[PDB]
Design a protein around this ligand. Structure first.
Ligand SMILES: [K+]
Ligand SMILES: [Mg+2]
Ligand SMILES: [Mg+2]
Ligand SMILES: [Zn+2]
Ligand SMILES: [Zn+2]
Ligand SMILES: [Zn+2]
Length: 144
RNA sequence: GAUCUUCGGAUCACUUUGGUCAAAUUGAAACGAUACAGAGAAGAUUAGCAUGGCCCCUGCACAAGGAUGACACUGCGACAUUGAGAGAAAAC
C-alpha cells in the first residue's frame, strides 16, 4: 500500500490522479478522527461511504471514460487503492450501484437475508424506507 | 437502471437494525475512617492436621495458603412410678 521515494515508480497515468487520491486519504483520516453522534455501529458508516466513493472513482476512470491504461488499473487494484471484489460486483447485472459488500452477504444477517437497501423501492412500503444500518445506504437497487 | 426483445415484454438483484437495555444523582462490587474489644489445646509460651456446611478469600489447580483461614464442638426425660405413712376426703 504505502509507497516510498525509492519504490518502483507507478505507471505513467498515476501522477494525473495522484492528488485526488491523496484527498481521499485526507477525508479518510478526518472520518477516523471525528467522533460521536451515533450508536456503536452508526459512527462507522462514513468509512464505507468513502471507500465506495474511491473505488467507484477508479472504476469510473477505467470502464466508462477510459482515462487510464489497463496496466495502471491493475496496479491500482493490486495496491488496494480499489476494492477488487466490489468492482467485480459492479460489473455484473443487478449490482451496478452496490453500496458495500456487507449488505449483500447473508451470513451477517439475523434471518439469512440481504440488507434492506437491496430491495427495490417499488416493492417497499413508505414507512420502511430508511437508511441502512451497515453503511447508511439509501437504496442500492439498480432500478432506483 | 444493464441486457436482449420487438415496442406486447422478458430477463438481473428482493425486507437491515447482537440489544446490563435512551446523553453518568434514584437498578455491573465492596468499602475508607474514627470510637469499643483487640490473637486456638483445662498455669505460661506457644508446632500444626483434621471433622460440619445457605462462610468464604488467594490460586491454573483434585498442590498449598489465608490465626491450626473463620464460625461451630452439650447435655438432655418412649420414667414406670410404687414403697410407705399422715392429716383430709368419700371408702375398706
Ligand atoms: K498456630
Ligand atoms: Mg489450611
Ligand atoms: Mg481449619
Ligand atoms: Zn452497505
Ligand atoms: Zn444495507
Ligand atoms: Zn446499500
Amino acid at each position: 500500500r504505502l509507497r516510498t521515494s525509492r519504490t518502483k515508480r507507478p505507471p505513467d497515468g498515476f501522477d494525473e490522479i495522484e492528488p485526488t487520491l491523496i484527498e481521499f486519504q485526507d477525508r479518510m483520516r478526518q472520518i477516523e478522527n471525528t467522533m460521536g453522534k451515533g450508536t456503536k455501529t452508526e459512527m462507522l458508516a462514513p468509512i464505507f461511504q468513502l471507500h465506495h466513493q474511491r473505488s467507484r472513482y477508479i472504476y469510473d476512470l477505467y470502464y466508462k471514460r477510459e482515462a487510464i491504461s489497463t496496466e495502471l488499473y491493475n496496479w491500482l487494484l493490486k495496491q488496494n487503492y480499489a476494492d477488487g471484489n466490489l468492482i467485480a460486483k459492479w460489473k455484473k447485472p443487478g449490482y451496478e450501484k452496490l453500496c458495500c459488500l456487507r449488505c449483500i452477504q447473508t451470513a451477517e444477517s439475523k434471518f439469512g437475508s440481504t440488507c434492506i437497501c437491496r430491495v427495490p423501492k417499488s416493492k417497499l412500503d413508505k414507512d420502511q424506507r430508511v437508511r441502512c444500518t451497515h453503511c447508511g445506504c439509501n437504496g442500492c437497487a439498480s432500478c432506483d
